[PDB]
Design an enzyme around this catalytic site. Structure first.
Site, PDB file in Angstrom:
ATOM      1  N   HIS A  15      25.908  -6.974   1.801  1.00 14.56           N
ATOM      2  CA  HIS A  15      25.177  -7.878   0.903  1.00 14.56           C
ATOM      3  C   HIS A  15      26.105  -8.662  -0.031  1.00 14.56           C
ATOM      4  O   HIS A  15      25.644  -9.521  -0.784  1.00 14.56           O
ATOM      5  CB  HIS A  15      24.200  -7.109   0.026  1.00 14.56           C
ATOM      6  CG  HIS A  15      22.824  -7.002   0.593  1.00 14.56           C
ATOM      7  ND1 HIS A  15      22.128  -8.095   1.063  1.00 14.56           N
ATOM      8  CD2 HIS A  15      21.992  -5.939   0.721  1.00 14.56           C
ATOM      9  CE1 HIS A  15      20.927  -7.711   1.457  1.00 14.56           C
ATOM     10  NE2 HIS A  15      20.818  -6.407   1.260  1.00 14.56           N
ATOM     11  N   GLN A  68      24.023  -2.063   2.607  1.00 12.92           N
ATOM     12  CA  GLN A  68      24.205  -2.538   1.249  1.00 12.92           C
ATOM     13  C   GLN A  68      25.529  -3.290   1.110  1.00 12.92           C
ATOM     14  O   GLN A  68      25.586  -4.347   0.500  1.00 12.92           O
ATOM     15  CB  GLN A  68      24.174  -1.366   0.273  1.00 12.92           C
ATOM     16  CG  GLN A  68      24.227  -1.790  -1.196  1.00 12.92           C
ATOM     17  CD  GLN A  68      23.094  -2.749  -1.563  1.00 12.92           C
ATOM     18  OE1 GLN A  68      23.291  -3.967  -1.668  1.00 12.92           O
ATOM     19  NE2 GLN A  68      21.899  -2.206  -1.736  1.00 12.92           N
ATOM     20  N   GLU A 106      20.542   1.046  -8.319  1.00  9.58           N
ATOM     21  CA  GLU A 106      19.495   0.105  -7.959  1.00  9.58           C
ATOM     22  C   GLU A 106      18.667   0.701  -6.810  1.00  9.58           C
ATOM     23  O   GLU A 106      17.441   0.750  -6.885  1.00  9.58           O
ATOM     24  CB  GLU A 106      20.101  -1.230  -7.515  1.00  9.58           C
ATOM     25  CG  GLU A 106      19.072  -2.175  -6.944  1.00  9.58           C
ATOM     26  CD  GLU A 106      19.666  -3.451  -6.407  1.00  9.58           C
ATOM     27  OE1 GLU A 106      20.825  -3.426  -5.936  1.00  9.58           O
ATOM     28  OE2 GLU A 106      18.957  -4.477  -6.439  1.00  9.58           O
ATOM     29  N   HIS A 107      19.343   1.143  -5.750  1.00  7.98           N
ATOM     30  CA  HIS A 107      18.664   1.746  -4.601  1.00  7.98           C
ATOM     31  C   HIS A 107      19.099   3.209  -4.494  1.00  7.98           C
ATOM     32  O   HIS A 107      20.297   3.488  -4.468  1.00  7.98           O
ATOM     33  CB  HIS A 107      19.057   1.057  -3.286  1.00  7.98           C
ATOM     34  CG  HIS A 107      18.810  -0.421  -3.245  1.00  7.98           C
ATOM     35  ND1 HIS A 107      17.614  -0.970  -2.828  1.00  7.98           N
ATOM     36  CD2 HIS A 107      19.636  -1.467  -3.489  1.00  7.98           C
ATOM     37  CE1 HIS A 107      17.719  -2.288  -2.811  1.00  7.98           C
ATOM     38  NE2 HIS A 107      18.937  -2.614  -3.208  1.00  7.98           N
ATOM     39  N   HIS A 133      -3.627  -8.781 -48.132  1.00  9.61           N
ATOM     40  CA  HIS A 133      -4.122  -7.997 -47.007  1.00  9.61           C
ATOM     41  C   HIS A 133      -5.227  -7.090 -47.505  1.00  9.61           C
ATOM     42  O   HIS A 133      -6.212  -6.851 -46.809  1.00  9.61           O
ATOM     43  CB  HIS A 133      -3.012  -7.132 -46.404  1.00  9.61           C
ATOM     44  CG  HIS A 133      -2.065  -7.884 -45.525  1.00  9.61           C
ATOM     45  ND1 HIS A 133      -1.226  -8.866 -46.003  1.00  9.61           N
ATOM     46  CD2 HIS A 133      -1.811  -7.783 -44.197  1.00  9.61           C
ATOM     47  CE1 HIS A 133      -0.492  -9.336 -45.008  1.00  9.61           C
ATOM     48  NE2 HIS A 133      -0.827  -8.694 -43.903  1.00  9.61           N
ATOM     49  N   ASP A 192      13.690  -3.568   2.161  1.00 10.94           N
ATOM     50  CA  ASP A 192      14.073  -4.960   1.943  1.00 10.94           C
ATOM     51  C   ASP A 192      13.094  -5.903   2.636  1.00 10.94           C
ATOM     52  O   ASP A 192      12.816  -6.983   2.135  1.00 10.94           O
ATOM     53  CB  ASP A 192      15.469  -5.279   2.512  1.00 10.94           C
ATOM     54  CG  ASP A 192      16.598  -4.629   1.740  1.00 10.94           C
ATOM     55  OD1 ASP A 192      16.430  -4.335   0.538  1.00 10.94           O
ATOM     56  OD2 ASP A 192      17.674  -4.432   2.342  1.00 10.94           O
TER      57      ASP A 192
END
Ligand SMILES: N[C@@H](Cc1c[nH]c[nH+]1)C(=O)O
Ligand SMILES: N[C@@H](Cc1c[nH]c[nH+]1)C(=O)O
Ligand SMILES: [Zn+2]
Ligand SMILES: [Zn+2]
EC number: 1.1.1.23
Lengths: 434, 431
Positions: A262, A259, A326-327, A419, A360
């Site tokens: 990245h 990670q 996120e992960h 209505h 991934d």
């Protein structure tokens, strides 16, 4: 090597503990916003001519044809190894199987006799995909985006990427059926997809992350009426690993580093009940980092990492849910058992043999996930993002008649006479006819 | 009146006919809503009480409506109404419960288990506009899906004093807390939270320009909260053939028109005769509507269009992408498949918009302003999120290892590749 070692959670004060669970803040740069603003208006007003002007001062070989030819694609294809082509085919097959499995079952029910209500799906008609260029081409994103779009039935799928476009991206696009690929990048490509030019078709929704200018461009076009919708807001990537005494330090460390490489802004976190595990992971990370070719990125990201020792797995889960990573990687003895207690996370990985890397690239799940906290309300990219839910209802005379009094009462309560009148007219018509 | 003969129009005049109004968003309000949020985030309740004095005579004391105050209101409502609401809620509950996503659990490959599960949005705040006649129906539309999704916290804000119908509605759908606050400050209270109002993860519900602007802003802030959807003027488009009933068509156009002066009202029909009769029925019915100044104002933007055939009605409708599409034709059902863009569709002569706004069970919180192109009607999904899960067995991982290394290697992600090699080597030594 210029950093921390470990953090004992319960040793921190209630305030410090709340400061850790917080993510960094982003600016706005009045300059980049204005720069991107002028880029978008320019591309909308002057089309391809405008794109070539940008291509000019941004390259030593101004782009000519914007649409990549079918010939250039077949050439790129032949230049790739069979090993790599087959690997992509495996990735696409599993990505396809997982997303195909997300097709919504038909929703068709009679809330009451004669009152039929349905929910049907319709695909977003046209979608644009953006893929950053550069040295290392992250062509896998192409597989993650184009695959779900194809399954959803989108009528048009096109892609933009900074020229020159790598053979891998071009091949990945062909493999997933991308219809058109364009030699454009940055805030201009987003503008081209969002507004349309002589060459680039205007699309309904734009998918794909990018640098600061791509992000700003996506934000701006999603906020304009003459623009387009976007997949989701961006933010720094994150990974949180929950590991007990049974985990392997090297496995934990390899995931934190995956990670971290990245981007210098990636957030990597480890939550473990064992101080011993934390120490071993910290050392494994240092040893592995020393073997990484170009680890300056990974190195800087690790300066903001947090290796936290907790009281037990329950406090690990409490902390993870507050964070909403996120992960989420669960390397504990009873990994699957914890899932149920996980109320917030983008994608969960269970056990020692489920590296983030597997997700991934080839497990089949989508790696385009919510981050920066958006896990609180947004979901992993999936089939639903390439579709729309539409409602349909039909009341029969019998169904309508039995519901009329209820509608009139409510309409009358809201003081919406028209209505109410719409029901009365139908009721009288039914008495009459029979 | 004034009938439009579509095909006698230039291709340009055409798109100009359906075009939706432009946007104001006057900076005047962009700033006003801005300093309002800041103030609420910094000086919580003290700010909220300072804004009560300003807008409305309430000088709000306790922000949370008491349980006793709710029980009193409930008793003041008629049985007829309370029963009407139970019918609505029961039907709405039945339609949304049916939207539950069946779990996804598959092995893309032997030993590679991938799942998609759902988790509810932790806490949600519901906004309900105040006034003399409040549209309490929206409460049933927002609070019911939230109940079904399993949201832990469900709260509602509404301009004080809050009518009995809203209080009863909230209570019936299980809303936990009701707060005496409205406008741009109610939104800020939900997004940032105060000493009385809890910070929520997502805010739902439409409102005036200020409410709309505050939602947009808090949705664009890291400190704020997510929102259900952008706003826009409501829309209604009716497709009617020679078999439709003029008065029915007119009553649906007027239903939409009576909402607000910016409502978009559109009729598409292949028969000039039908268009002319509908215009006359609209005229007659209009003269009997009490609160009909706005209806008339909305009609200034209406379009009564005559097409060449039914197919062309479908073409124009799909281009426009109306919030509500009513198909009053003899084979309505068969047309549905050819409809690619609309918020909610109503089929036949006995499916008035009123039914959907109130008790058919569908949700009347729909995408408008052309957003039907990518956005969807409010449903269960807007109150939850999809989370994926994967678990690779030793066999599954080993069968995929090579593929992952090859891919990671091509993207020059060394650490990604080494994470696989470490595991493959460990397995080799235990084999
Ligand atoms: N981690 C990347 C996905 C990825 C591509 N290659 C490896 N990982 C993301 O945040 O989207
Ligand atoms: N017709 C409104 C909803 C409504 C409330 N009350 C009556 N109708 C809309 O969908 O915008
Ligand atoms: Zn990765
Ligand atoms: Zn209505």
């Amino acid at each position: 090597m210029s950093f921390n070692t470990i953090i004992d959670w319960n040793s921190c004060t209630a305030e410090q503990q709340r400061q850790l669970l917080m993510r960094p803040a982003i600016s706005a740069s009045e300059s980049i916003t204005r720069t991107v603003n002028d880029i978008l208006d320019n591309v909308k007003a002057r089309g391809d001519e405008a794109l070539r002007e940008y291509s000019a001062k941004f390259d030593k070989t101004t782009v000519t044809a914007l649409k990549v030819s079918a010939e250039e694609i077949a050439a790129a294809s032949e230049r790739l190894s069979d090993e790599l082509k087959q690997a992509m085919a495996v990735a696409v097959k599993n990505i396809e199987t997982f997303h195909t499995a997300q097709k919504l079952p038909p929703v068709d029910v009679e809330t009451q006799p004669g009152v039929r209500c349905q929910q049907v799906t319709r695909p977003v008609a046209s979608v644009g995909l953006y893929i950053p260029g550069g040295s290392a081409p992250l062509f896998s994103t192409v597989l993650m985006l184009a695959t779900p779009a194809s399954i959803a039935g989108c009528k048009k799928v096109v892609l933009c990427s900074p020229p020159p476009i790598a053979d891998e991206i071009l091949y990945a696009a062909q493999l997933c059926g991308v219809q058109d690929v364009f030699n454009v990048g940055g805030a201009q490509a987003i503008a081209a997809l969002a507004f349309g030019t002589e060459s680039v078709p205007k699309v309904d929704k734009i998918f794909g992350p990018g640098n600061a200018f791509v992000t700003e461009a996506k934000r701006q076009v999603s906020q304009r009426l003459d623009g387009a919708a976007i997949d989701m807001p961006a933010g720094p990537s994150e990974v949180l690993v929950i590991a007990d005494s049974g985990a392997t330090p090297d496995f934990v460390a390899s995931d934190l580093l995956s990670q971290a490489e990245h981007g210098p802004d990636s957030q990597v976190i480890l939550l473990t009940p064992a101080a011993d595990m934390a120490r071993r992971v910290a050392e494994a990370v240092e040893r592995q980092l020393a073997e990484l070719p170009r680890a300056e990125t990974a190195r800087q990201a690790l300066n903001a990492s947090r290796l936290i020792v907790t009281k037990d797995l329950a406090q690990c889960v409490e902390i993870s849910n507050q964070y909403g990573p996120e992960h989420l990687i669960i390397q504990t003895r009873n990994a699957r058992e914890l899932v149920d207690s996980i109320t917030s996370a983008g994608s969960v990985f269970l056990g020692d043999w489920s590296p983030e890397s597997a997700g991934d690239y080839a497990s089949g799940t989508n790696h385009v996930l919510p981050t920066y906290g958006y896990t609180a309300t947004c979901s992993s990219l999936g089939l639903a993002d390439f579709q729309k839910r539409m409602t349909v209802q039909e009341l029969s005379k019998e169904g309508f008649s039995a519901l009329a009094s209820t509608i009139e009462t409510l309409a009358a309560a809201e003081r919406l006479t028209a209505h109410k009148n719409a029901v009365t007219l139908r009721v009288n018509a039914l008495k009459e006819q029979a």
